[PDB]
Design an enzyme around this catalytic site. Sequence first.
Site, PDB file in Angstrom:
ATOM      1  CD  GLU F  59      46.406  43.468  31.230  1.00 19.32           C
ATOM      2  OE1 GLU F  59      47.730  43.417  31.502  1.00 19.32           O
ATOM      3  OE2 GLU F  59      45.638  42.960  32.024  1.00 19.32           O
ATOM      4  CG  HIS F  60      44.364  46.965  35.127  1.00 23.43           C
ATOM      5  ND1 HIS F  60      45.254  46.967  36.181  1.00 23.43           N
ATOM      6  CD2 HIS F  60      43.288  46.203  35.459  1.00 23.43           C
ATOM      7  CE1 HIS F  60      44.365  46.637  37.207  1.00 23.43           C
ATOM      8  NE2 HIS F  60      43.213  45.993  36.666  1.00 23.43           N
ATOM      9  CD  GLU F 136      47.372  42.628  39.099  1.00 21.67           C
ATOM     10  OE1 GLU F 136      46.695  43.450  39.122  1.00 21.67           O
ATOM     11  OE2 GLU F 136      47.270  41.399  38.555  1.00 21.67           O
TER      12      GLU F 136
END
Lengths: 56, 292, 420, 51, 99, 445
Positions: F59-60, F136
């Site tokens: 997804e990243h 993150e």
Amino acid sequence: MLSVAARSGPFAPVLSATSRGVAGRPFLCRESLSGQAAARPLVATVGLNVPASVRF
Amino acid sequence: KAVAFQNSQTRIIENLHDVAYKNALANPLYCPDYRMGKITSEELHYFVQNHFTSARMALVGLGVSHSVLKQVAEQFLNMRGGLGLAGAKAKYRGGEIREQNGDNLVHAAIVAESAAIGNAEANAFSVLQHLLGAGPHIKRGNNTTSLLSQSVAKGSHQPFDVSAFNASYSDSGLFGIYTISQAAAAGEVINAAYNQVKAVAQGNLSSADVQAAKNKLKAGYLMSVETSEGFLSEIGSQALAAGSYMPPSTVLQQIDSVADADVVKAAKKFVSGKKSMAASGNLGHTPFLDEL
Amino acid sequence: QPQDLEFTKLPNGLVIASLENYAPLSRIGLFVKAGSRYEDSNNLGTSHLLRLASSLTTKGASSFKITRGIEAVGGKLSVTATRENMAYTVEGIRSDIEILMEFLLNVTTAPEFRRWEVAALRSQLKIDKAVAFQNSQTRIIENLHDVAYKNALANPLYCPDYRMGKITSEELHYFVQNHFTSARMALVGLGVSHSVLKQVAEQFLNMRGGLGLAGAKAKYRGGEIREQNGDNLVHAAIVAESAAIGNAEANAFSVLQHLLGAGPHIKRGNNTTSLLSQSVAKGSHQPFDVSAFNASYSDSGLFGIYTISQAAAAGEVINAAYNQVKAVAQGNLSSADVQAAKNKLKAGYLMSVETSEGFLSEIGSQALAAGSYMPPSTVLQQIDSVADADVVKAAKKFVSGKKSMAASGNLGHTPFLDEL
Amino acid sequence: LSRFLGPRYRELARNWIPTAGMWGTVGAVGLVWATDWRLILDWVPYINGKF
Amino acid sequence: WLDGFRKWYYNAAGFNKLGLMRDDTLHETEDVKEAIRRLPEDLYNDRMFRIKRALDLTMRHQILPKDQWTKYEEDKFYLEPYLKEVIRERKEREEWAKK
Amino acid sequence: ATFAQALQSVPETQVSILDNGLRVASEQSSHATCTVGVWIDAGSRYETEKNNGAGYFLEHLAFKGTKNRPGNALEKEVESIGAHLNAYSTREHTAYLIKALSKDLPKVVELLADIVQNSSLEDSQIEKERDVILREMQENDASMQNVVFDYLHATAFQGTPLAQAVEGPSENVRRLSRTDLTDYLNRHYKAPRMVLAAAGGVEHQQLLDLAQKHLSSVSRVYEEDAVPGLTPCRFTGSEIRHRDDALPLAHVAIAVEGPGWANPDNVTLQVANAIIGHYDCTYGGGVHLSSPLASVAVANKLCQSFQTFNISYSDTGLLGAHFVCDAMSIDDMVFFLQGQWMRLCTSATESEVTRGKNILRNALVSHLDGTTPVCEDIGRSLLTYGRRIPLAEWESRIQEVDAQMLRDICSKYFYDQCPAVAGYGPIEQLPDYNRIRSGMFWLRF
């Protein structure tokens, strides 16, 4: 154009504060005021057994 | 901090020094609201190990002879020799912090950069400070022949408290005008006081009033002299600023050597310098740097 | 078929717009020109307590009947407030939109404003100020407007701590008497028929038919605030004067904003066509976020650079961003990048259009300020009519105008406005 | 009383009819088992004989 | 005659002699205590002064003289526009609970 | 017109299957925007302890590297067309979303076809994105409700594939190489586990011609005929309590296993969950709010916020309440929450369930108002429900729900069940698990 979200995209929640209301001595005298100004700058005194004094 | 900030004036002086400097004099003297809970013992030991130095400090004594003071200075004082950081020259910034407090009395102060302690203009700026008036001499009096309380009360029937304000340091001083008033007529007292300093910047002054200003400054220095706490503070301030003591008779001579045109030059430097303003209260009629 | 929105004007003075979408959601919104710039310095925070007083009692219904009625119908009653406009907005089911309309028009028309209700509401004022100042953007947006304007728009969106405990119901009643009136009011409706909304507006809006107390003209102030926060993320923003909304300079300024990166178009991306982000990331390697933001009000507007940086490299970030806007002002521009900025502004305006609360806010602000509804295709024609020389002229106007800077964080390497 | 009489309280009372009636039979059967009534325990066929 | 009988009942009730008007001798229920929260500050302050002076007088087991008794024509019904609002709000709350 | 005629007049979703089995759905309406997204059935489920952060990493990573348009050419093309992207990854769905104008539609679906198939995976971007993912994930400890939801998914489904996070642990991020990520891409990004949602502004024959041109023949046949398989995950009623007494606010969630997506009772468990409702301290309703737990909470100042959730997965769900409370009222919030839950479960009224049915109807049409969340509903409904349920059928499922029906299927899914309890903060005045269980089942009934 003439909106809040049309001007700035991500900045609409920070310039548009929404609010869901439901669930979804005063020195009163001129002669007594003589001495409340600043003649000399900020001097702070903190003592051991003497209280705080500010020299102005 | 919450007891010492019940005085309204020290918040204005703290905001004034926060505005009127860029770095290394713009740090507040009281602690900020967030650092309580953040100041560490390593931070205090770094501050003491850098900036509490025997080559930096002085030790003065009143009522105590020289022999036991020199013995104590040889015993427990002569260890540190590293001078640490010497500051960053205190560059002038200029601007406005204008908060609101809800008091009926606005407290505003308009200040420009002046000369430092040891220069040939700080004595003239202090003669100008006592010429515009900074002391309640007759208590519960009009403070009549001070020029600011003259020229405000020529126009305003409101209660006020207007004075001069000299904050002299070793890098660059701060000369300014302090106004406390009711918030409905802040523009009248501020513009009348600044028009009085604009009048004295054109040379509209009397040499008898310069002599009264000089005698008021000599009286104020001897007020600083006469108490032994004040004498200890004056000997310590002269010891840290100069390293050799200057006698108060020569202080009276240096105050008496201030010419009548030097305070006109000081008011011209106050007018032509960049301004700085700190104000708090109801700010409906408080003017700005564009209006001054 | 969704018919075009009629944007009509009552003889009372109100601008009323309504369309039927045959929608699941019937939304009715009353738009008042009674924001923070319309409240004055003597009555400050009155707009915040009036925004929190949407669920209070009113002349026609008690507050318990208001909250139980909106929750029994199922709709929501929320007010969105800018510094200029406030927008009461009730959405709900299409069957009980009459009950939602009478509750919303009772609340917006004739509130009681009893003193125990606002004495309970000042704790909610403190909680709402603490929640809105948990976010670091809103605090320096408020102090940015405080330093960027002189008297009118410099009044804060949230109530300051000196007025907390001193907001009186008489001042609340005086502000809602002097600034909730018909000639500045615009009432728009999605999913509600126009004759039904005309009947509800004429049966409850005969009261308060004046023009209102005139708001002060905002003038530019300048200068800085610079204050310490206590985090490694320093937020610093430098703005200057831009034109009011409805002007060709402001249409140039929004496309100059979308040239210099209005926000993250890509989730977790690098934003590799925004010239501010390229000219900051060519010199900086620490994590950051450099955007440009535009905020155009009815009289004067602000355009500027908002940089979120670490405390060490923030001087290089702010000076590299300002040198990038200097390069735009001398004219180092690509016409394909200007066309991409035009397509970004057209697409972002369509993102504002495509949600029904955003569409209701769009025609509420259009019928409130301008009083006429341009088509979105006409908005696309205006954005396509904006060309490169207006972007160069607006960048020269921003770099030559007087600036104002709001900063927050560890401030040891944050540059000053004279140092820029 | 006047605030306790209504349609919603009648529906809540109708919802609380069977478990409170079953608790009443719990109290009645427990009272019978505690006191050992000769009229009632002579009808149950497991304690039919003499106890 | 009914006003004369009401004035005789006001004299026979005894709190006109003692220094209280009609709305100080209410039972502090949740509605009356909600109205206690809902008075303005000056009316609250001299109401609690009148209750404290009444407690001082019934501690001393004596009353004021007749020139400073609270008359029936000098009685004000200050709590009644607050207590009627609290009673009708509680009535609509119990009707919504019945609904 | 009326409500049933209006939701009939809401347009249908034509759903069609390509030559490889990929599902395409669209909702043509009047607006000129266009919100094309690919929903993939991959998530934190269908991952082992190995390759655990592969879904969050992909997804990243699907925007940074491409075979045909390498580097940041995806970003340059999508800002030449001026569009916006989104990529949310959940336990059972990952997705890629583009909101755009409708005249950029072959560019949008060509960029999606280069994202989901022809994504290149450079190892410098793997190392850079691993550092950004670690930073993150260090920043995600401030996201306290996400921490408590991840703790609740860890303690509710222990020993199952639902125990793990979507992000994966820090000892599993650092060993994720390129070949494990392309094994995850070759296994779980297969074409009939992928839908193509459009919402308004499009034409469905145009979308099927563009999906024939671009998104046809992704991957259909597995490598060694090794199919992935969904398993029924065990719900274990447990308690985790991260005690941080210097931390200011305690986030505590209590959840019971609900029926999930494919079971038809998500409407009645959602109408019980919406009778219970939600509160935050910025809500200006006050004491007069309709939900009695929120009314009691603001009456005696219990908590700052509470949110009642029905998070659903295929046959297994977590339905419960998560509250941000102080250190001194967790016992009060737990007692009043279980008291409101089983006051609902014993004495449900017709006024309460018509309030809940009205608030569910408004919540579903306010969720499916916008184009991006109605594409979220199209993708989630096509992956989970099989068909996409229209809102007229949702209204027909809502209108059959009464208080008697709510009472017995609440007795099925609430009464005397062992819940999962998570807590981050000062969790001292949380009751212990036997007091949670004694406060569940009622002393009267």
